[PDB]
Ligand binder design. Structure first.
Ligand SMILES: OC[C@H]1O[C@@H](O[C@H]2[C@H](O)[C@@H](O)[C@H](O[C@@H]3[C@@H](O)[C@@H](O)O[C@H](CO)[C@H]3O)O[C@@H]2CO)[C@H](O)[C@@H](O)[C@@H]1O
Ligand SMILES: OC[C@H]1O[C@@H](O[C@H]2[C@H](O)[C@@H](O)[C@H](O)O[C@@H]2CO)[C@H](O)[C@@H](O)[C@@H]1O
Ligand code: CA
Length: 260
């Protein structure tokens, strides 16, 4: 654990809600809130991932009974022009080009996708990607890899601190039955520090060293939100269990708060 935290977190009293998706409207995700990422479907995704992210496909991404559903399936979507030979479909949504935030408290209430292979994620990347990944700054509010389905991972990545060179700043905790019950996954991002937590408890803290070095604090510019369920890579360490499909992440809401 390279970014340990141990402190409470809660929506600050002096913040207001500035953005939410409550997933109130069944059917397609609200196109004024979310866009689909298809950028690497034909080529194969990063992290040796095994999914095809289907855009506009209710089988993988839909709003039902007040929840977003991102569902993994074992199927070859060979009719898709951007199909890349994948054995699985899934979803990836982001607020890129629609909404982003510099600082804030982000709360996502979600039930995660289980089964060996599954890699549900709730994360952020900087809107200004001119420095490339990883320099632009990424915030993993929640990852879980379903070979270890009770373990919630909270991580940030920067030019200096990232998984490629094993310097990522992260921590972890566990939660009761994360695929069977909702928990709140939360980020408290200020100019001084990030806390990442579950159910009101920060288990991860990453401070701004205030050295003005973009390499170690790229987080004084806006980030957009990403929701996806990857398959394989880190999620596939103990293989991809065909019996687990279909598997779904349900997201009751995303709420963003900022200094009133
Ligand atoms: O390998 C260089 C290419 O990286 C691309 O960026 C990827 C990166 O490869 C990938 O490891 C990273 O994966 C994410 C994790 O770092 C973490 O943030 O959690 C995410 C959700 O689980 C996980 O996807 O994603 C990067 C962004 O897709 C660059 O896009 C590319 O230009 C570069 O050549
Ligand atoms: O593989 C990408 C994945 O890397 C994760 O980093 C560490 C992780 O913190 C640690 O718990 C595990 O044992 O090693 C991995 C790979 O070095 C990182 O936490 C994620 O954000 C990232 O998606
Ligand atoms: Ca809801």
């Amino acid at each position: 654990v390279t970014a340990p935290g141990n402190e409470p977190m809660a929506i600050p009293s002096d913040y207001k809600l500035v953005w939410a998706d409550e997933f109130n409207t069944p059917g397609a995700p609200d196109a004024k809130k979310w866009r689909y990422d298809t950028s690497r479907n034909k080529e194969g995704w990063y992290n040796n991932e095994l999914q095809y992210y289907a855009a506009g496909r209710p089988e993988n991404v839909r709003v039902e009974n007040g929840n977003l559903v991102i569902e993994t399936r074992k199927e070859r979507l060979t009719s898709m022009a951007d199909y890349g030979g994948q054995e699985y479909s899934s979803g990836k949504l982001f607020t890129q080009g629609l909404a982003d935030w510099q600082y804030g408290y982000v709360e996502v209430r979600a039930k995660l996708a289980c089964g060996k292979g599954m890699w549900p994620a709730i994360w952020m990347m900087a809107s200004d990607g001119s420095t490339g990944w990883p320099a632009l700054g990424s915030i993993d509010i929640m990852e879980m890899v379903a070979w270890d389905p009770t373990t919630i991972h909270g991580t940030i990545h920067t030019k200096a601190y990232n998984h490629v060179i094993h310097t990522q700043k992260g921590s972890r905790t566990t939660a009761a039955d994360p695929c069977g019950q909702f928990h709140t996954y939360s980020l408290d991002w200020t100019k001084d520090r990030m806390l990442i937590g579950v159910d009101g408890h920060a288990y991860m803290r990453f401070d701004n060293d205030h050295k003005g070095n973009h390499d170690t604090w790229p987080f004084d510019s806006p980030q957009y939100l990403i929701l996806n369920v990857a398959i394989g890579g880190w999620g596939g360490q103990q293989g991809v269990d065909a019996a687990a499909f279909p598997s779904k992440m349900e997201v009751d809401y995303v709420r963003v708060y900022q200094k009133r």
